[PDB]
């Protein structure tokens, strides 16, 4: 099986937002709207905004899951490579096999699906802080796209789903991710490739 990636705002008008970090050599996380693609360094903070048009009910949650973007790999579970799963960099909550972690939220829950074996991380929805119009989740990606025996240079998508208390779908959005040493340079390169095409 393969999780759906269809964008779905749903009844609450759910969608993602990203900061405008630029493409300087020093940038650690940067989002390309033209590519719908996040470029980030290993284990660095990736701020992802959640936006809604109306308030979802108490108990609504936000889940993140990675899948391979290419159809011929979509049924393979995205996991950390044989090196990183053994490097003992745990935060005490994320299983060492999980690619995606949530940073700084003790209510994050990590799921190994008993039927699909896919990994995901889910947090309770919290309303924006006073003076803010959206809520931000801080994600970390714990392997490079190039890691041998893991992603092995294959592109991935992150699927973000808004779910009710039973796990039923309320909204969905997604973005491609490249985890790399120089996200600013790679974003510039890929945007230029797109322009040349
Ligand atoms: C279910 C708890 C409340 O959830 C929200 C409420 C509001 C609001 O304006 O009332 C909001 O703007 C957002 I963004 C969320 N939200 C947090 C994560 C996903 C959606
Ligand atoms: Zn790795």
From Swiss-Prot:
Reported impact of residue 161 to P: In sporadic cancers; somatic mutation
Outcome reported for the amino acid change (mutating residue 16 to M): In a sporadic cancer; somatic mutation
Known outcome of mutating residue 29 to W: In a sporadic cancer; somatic mutation
Outcome following mutation: residue 92 to R: In sporadic cancers; somatic mutation
Stated consequence of mutating residue 95 to S: In sporadic cancers; somatic mutation
Effect on the protein of changing residue 105 to I: In sporadic cancers; somatic mutation
Effect in UniProt of substituting residue 89 to Y: In sporadic cancers; somatic mutation
Variant or mutagenesis effect after changing residue 52 to E: In sporadic cancers; somatic mutation
Outcome, altering residue 90 to G: In sporadic cancers; somatic mutation
Effect of residue 110 to D: In sporadic cancers; somatic mutation
Protein name: Cellular tumor antigen p53
Taxonomic lineage of the native organism: Eukaryota, Metazoa, Chordata, Craniata, Vertebrata
Recorded name of the encoding gene: TP53
Covered residues, full protein: 96 to 292 of 393
């Amino acid at each position: 099986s393969v999780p759906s990636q269809k964008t779905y705002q749903g009844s609450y008008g759910f969608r993602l937002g990203f900061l405008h970090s630029g493409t300087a050599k020093s940038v650690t996380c940067t989002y390309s709207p033209a590519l719908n693609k996040l470029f980030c360094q290993l284990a660095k903070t990736c701020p992802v905004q959640l936006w809604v048009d109306s308030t979802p009910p108490p108990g609504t949650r936000v889940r993140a899951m990675a899948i391979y973007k290419q159809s011929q790999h979509m049924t393979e579970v995205v996991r950390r490579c044989p090196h990183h799963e053994r490097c003992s960099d745990s935060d005490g909550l994320a299983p060492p096999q999980h690619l995606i972690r949530v940073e700084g939220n003790l209510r994050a829950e990590y799921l190994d699906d008993r039927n699909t074996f896919r990994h995901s991380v889910v947090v309770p929805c919290e309303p924006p802080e006073v003076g803010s119009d959206c809520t931000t989740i801080h994600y970390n990606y714990m392997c490079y796209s190039s890691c041998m025996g893991g992603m092995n240079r294959r592109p991935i998508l992150t699927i973000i789903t808004l779910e009710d208390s039973s796990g039923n779908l309320l909204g969905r959005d997604s973005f491609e991710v490249r985890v790399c040493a120089c996200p600013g340079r790679d974003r510039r390169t890929e945007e230029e490739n797109l322009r040349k095409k």
